[PDB]
Design a protein around this ligand. Structure first.
Ligand SMILES: *[C@@H]1O[C@H](CO)[C@@H](O[C@@H]2O[C@H](CO)[C@@H](O[C@@H]3O[C@H](CO[C@H]4O[C@H](CO)[C@@H](O)[C@H](O[C@H]5O[C@H](CO)[C@@H](O)[C@H](O)[C@@H]5O[C@H]5O[C@H](CO)[C@@H](O)[C@H](O)[C@@H]5O)[C@@H]4O)[C@@H](O)[C@H](O[C@H]4O[C@H](CO)[C@@H](O)[C@H](O)[C@@H]4O[C@H]4O[C@H](CO)[C@@H](O)[C@H](O)[C@@H]4O)[C@@H]3O)[C@H](O)[C@H]2NC(C)=O)[C@H](O)[C@H]1NC(C)=O
Ligand code: Y4Z
Ligand code: CA
Ligand code: CA
Ligand code: CL
Ligand code: K
Ligand code: NA
Ligand code: ZN
Length: 805
């Protein structure tokens, strides 16, 4: 209940919301049906519109006007944003040359440069170039400030997940806003775009920037605007707040525009109708910047212009229907559209079965435009599984498509021509970032980066300590002129052992065999040096990874590769090796096909055994350093050490063998040598973090050999490919992947074909950041380079996407 008979006099857009049933005058009061009776009259004035004209200059203040052109308006802080242009002969901000802002130039009493976040819904990255002729204010922010060619949103590429990701630095699985629509089975409640449930604070996890600022004594404008408040009034309200006394004035503000998204849905991302919405957004930016210039704040404020997601061409005719695949369609609930999430319609129906639903949805039609997944099997780069609000069954929908349950859903709900939500690597889903102000760099282009990184930087801009989040603090220091965050590398927690030869062959009873008993001081001293680390500088180019948790492990050196061998998991945590452009591929000689050799540096009790693999009818094994890339027939024996072996399903061995035999050499040719680090990942609770021993759900039958859920590789070379990977003087280049370790290749519809037709496509789907692998393994890479640590942090957040331009 609201007793709406109080008054908004002197309270318009008040910053602290008053409690029920007292009536509200804050920018959200309309959304709660709670404004005072006179809110419209007092707070939403419109008379005479939004611009001064020649004949209004010096007018007698009329308090009814939307904004003012009277002489006292500057010190009232309520002039129309074009006041000084129309009436005092000033230029528009956009018509001024840009001049580097080396220091904040702020009015007296400003403790810090304010931060204004100008967010645009559905602003696709390519609009910056394609709409540049009609967006001169935005183009000036872009060219004069710091900009990225695009910013990667989070998945799903919808509004609510992305804006709350911007606000918190968190993946949706962690912040809890995992779609625009959600069912939470613990609450037994639903979240929807329309309605009241979304206002309940139990949905919203982590700590958003406005709460972060308030807790640390930095005042925040309210970030939310009821939909009926026009853009011009939002801008004027911000400008009015910036005129408050020092003790009352916020330091951070947000503006939000529902455009261009609103129009993009109706007309598609490049519909001829899209020009006007782009012009109108630019005009709004112009009003803000003219308004700041009037207040002498245009070389004081840091402005961020940022989008939440792009927009793709999608029409009603490009809809797949689950009723064309499933017999039981009425026993499921689907969250539909540019992604699918399926759960049982009724929890009392014990005949519902996810295994048969997935199978009925797998590779059933030749050009099927969605792919079903158990959530834990989704590409790890999406970080979309660790939340009870994310249904076990997920459909990744092809760009340009929808999924729906039955045709009646699409016509008893063509309207739309645009939509978004798809995989966040899709070019059309990329969005925009520009930073302009004293704290950002001047005329600087930076590489694309993920929106999860921005919360940290917004905290840096305001002198706040960020709450714990998924950004990598420091990875965006190259955006900033000052206020950088200078992190130190994490300390290694476990130091390695360096075992020498400690065991005789006959102490091992592993059921392994090798045809290796074929008998020289020239080469005897040589093998010894290699086992002591003489080639290590060649194969371990960036220092050994640091182990950031408590465990027992050994460094093992070899001619062709170096490993960190875990005595706990009975396999390497990592295996590092370098392949030059010149390297040659050989085959596994016949007499060595089933060779596994005990490692006399490592106890039988800390070794895998061959008998377990013989006994386990489902599980085979592979090797981390590939025998195909051995430097010589003699070095090849090292590759068959039991300490280089890892458990692998036969179906996965197809993938792995193709990567090792064909792709590594291919990359070394193309990149001028590569350094490779490969290893296992265990993430049985799909939280994106390294499993402890007691979390492992599967072992090789009859043994303590844990089965990895994934295998990773980190592939590094010189950014200047005129230099070989092992003699690189400058910046590095990386690509990585986290391949799911699956007992079938059902994920790849063309897997009956030769690996050359499907494996690389699978690997590209499972592209990863080095950082993703760090979380999954508890390792810290690139500890020893000649590069600055912030530059290494940027490299560790890089994702190779394989999208075209
Ligand atoms: C991305 O960044 C984020 C932020 O850093 C990373 O997430 C953190 O990861 C930590 C490890 O998983 C986790 O730390 C745990 O904290 C638990 C207390 O959590 C509450 O308090 C914090 C602080 O304010 C709060 O943020 C939490 O918020 C979560 O839950 C609420 C309510 O449900 C949601 O609204 C909110 O969105 C958020 O949900 C997300 O996280 C939870 C996990 O906490 C998931 O379940 C959700 O799906 C969702 O993703 C909480 O309100 C604390 O209980 C934990 O302690 C356990 O382990 C320690 C070892 O240190 C030990 O002392 C105890 O034994 C204890 O175990 C006990 O509980 C077990 C489970 O019931 C049980 O098995 C045992 O027997 C024990 O009884 C733990 O320390 C931290 O909370 C999150 N933070 C956030 C915001 O998500 C994330 O990892 C990063 N991702 C990547 C890939 O890097
Ligand atoms: N009516 C409205 O005001 N909005 C439209 C509805 C969806 C929405 C808005 N905001 C607030 C917001 C505005 C501008 C930037 C921003 O992000 C930043 F905090 F990072 F700056 C956040 C949200 C924050 C979290 C989740 C959903 C939303 C806005
Ligand atoms: Ca949006
Ligand atoms: Ca885990
Ligand atoms: Cl959704
Ligand atoms: K087997
Ligand atoms: Na297949
Ligand atoms: Zn939209």
């Amino acid at each position: 209940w609201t007793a709406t008979s109080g008054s908004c006099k002197g309270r318009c857009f008040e910053l602290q919301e008053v409690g029920p049933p007292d009536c509200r005058c804050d920018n959200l009061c309309k959304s709660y049906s709670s404004c005072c009776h006179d809110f419209d009259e007092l707070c939403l004035k419109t008379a005479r519109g939004w611009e001064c004209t020649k004949d209004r200059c010096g007018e007698v203040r009329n308090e009814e006007n939307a904004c003012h052109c009277s002489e006292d308006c500057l010190s009232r802080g309520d002039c129309c944003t074009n006041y000084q242009v129309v009436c005092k002969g000033e230029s528009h901000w956009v018509d001024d040359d840009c001049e580097e802002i080396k220091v904040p130039e702020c009015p007296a009493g400003f403790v810090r440069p304010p931060l204004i976040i100008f967010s645009v819904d559905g602003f696709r990255a390519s609009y910056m170039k394609k709409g540049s002729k009609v967006m001169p204010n935005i183009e000036k922010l872009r060219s004069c400030g710091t900009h990225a060619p695009y910013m990667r949103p989070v998945y799903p590429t919808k509004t609510f997940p992305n804006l709350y990701t911007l606000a918190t630095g968190l993946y949706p699985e962690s912040h809890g806003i995992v779609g625009n629509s959600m069912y939470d089975p613990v609450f037994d409640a639903s979240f929807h775009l329309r309605g009241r449930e979304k206002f309940n604070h139990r949905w919203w996890g982590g700590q958003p920037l406005w709460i972060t600022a308030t807790k640390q004594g930095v005042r925040a404008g309210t970030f939310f605007w009821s939909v009926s408040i026009p853009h011009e009034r939002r801008i004027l309200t911000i400008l009015q707040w910036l005129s408050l006394p020092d003790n009352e004035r916020p330091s951070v503000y947000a503006f939000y525009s529902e455009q261009p998204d609103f129009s993009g849905h109706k007309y598609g991302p490049f519909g001829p109708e899209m020009t006007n919405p782009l012009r109108e957004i630019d005009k709004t930016v112009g009003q803000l910047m003219d308004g700041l210039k009037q207040l002498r704040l245009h070389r004081c404020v840091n402005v961020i212009f940022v989008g939440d997601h792009g927009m793709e061409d999608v029409t009603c005719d490009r809809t797949e229907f689950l009723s064309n695949y499933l017999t039981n369609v009425d026993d499921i609930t689907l969250v539909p559209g540019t992604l699918g999430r399926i759960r049982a319609k009724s929890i009392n129906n014990s005949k519902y079965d996810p295994k048969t639903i997935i199978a009925a949805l797998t590779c059933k039609k030749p050009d099927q435009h969605f792919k079903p997944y158990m959530k834990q099997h989704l590409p790890k780069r999406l970080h979309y599984a660790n939340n009870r609000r994310i249904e076990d069954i997920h459909l990744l929908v092809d760009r340009r498509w929808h999924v729906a349950r039955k045709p009646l859903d699409v016509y008893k709900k063509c309207f739309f021509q645009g939509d978004h939500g798809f995989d966040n690597k899709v070019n059309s889903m990329q969005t925009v970032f520009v930073g302009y102000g004293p704290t950002f760099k001047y005329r600087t282009k930076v590489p694309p980066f993920e929106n999860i990184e921005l919360y940290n930087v917004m905290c840096d801009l305001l002198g706040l300590k960020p709450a714990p989040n998924n950004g990598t603090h420091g990875s965006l220091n190259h955006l900033l002129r000052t206020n950088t965050f200078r992190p130190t590398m994490p300390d290694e927690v476990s130091r390695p052992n360096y075992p020498g030869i400690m065991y005789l062959q006959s102490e091992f009873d592993l059921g392994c065999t090798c045809d290796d008993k074929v008998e020289n001081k020239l080469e005897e001293l040589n093998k010894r040096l290699h086992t002591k680390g003489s080639t290590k500088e060649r194969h371990l180019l960036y220092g050994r990874p640091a182990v950031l948790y408590r465990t027992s492990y050994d460094i093992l050196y070899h001619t062709d590769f170096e490993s960190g061998y875990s005595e706990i998991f009975l396999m390497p945590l990592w295996t590092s090796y370098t392949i030059s452009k010149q390297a040659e591929v050989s085959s596994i000689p016949e007499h060595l096909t089933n060779c596994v050799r005990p490692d006399v540096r490592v106890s039988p009790g800390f070794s895998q055994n061959c008998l377990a693999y013989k006994n386990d009818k489902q599980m085979s094994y592979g090797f981390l350093f590939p025998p195909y890339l051995s430097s010589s027939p003699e070095a090849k024996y090292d590759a068959f050490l039991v300490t280089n072996m890892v458990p692998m399903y036969p179906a996965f061995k197809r993938v792995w063998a193709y990567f090792q035999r064909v792709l590594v050499k291919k990359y070394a040719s193309e990149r001028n040598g590569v350094n490779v680090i490969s290893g296992p990942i265990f993430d049985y609770n799909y939280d994106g973090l390294r499993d402890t021993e007691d979390e492992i759900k599967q072992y090789v039958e009859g043994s303590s050999i844990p089965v990895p859920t994934h295998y990773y590789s980190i592939i590094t070379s010189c950014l200047d490919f005129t230099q070989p990977a092992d003699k690189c003087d400058g910046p590095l280049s990386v690509s990585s992947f986290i391949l799911p370790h699956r007992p079938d290749n059902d994920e790849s519809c063309n897997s009956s074909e030769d690996e050359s037709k499907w494996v690389e496509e699978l690997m590209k789907m499972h592209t990863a950041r080095v950082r993703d692998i760090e979380h999954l393994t508890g390792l810290d890479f690139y500890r020893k380079t000649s590069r600055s640590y912030s530059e290494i942090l940027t490299l560790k957040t890089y994702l190779h996407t394989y999208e075209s331009e």
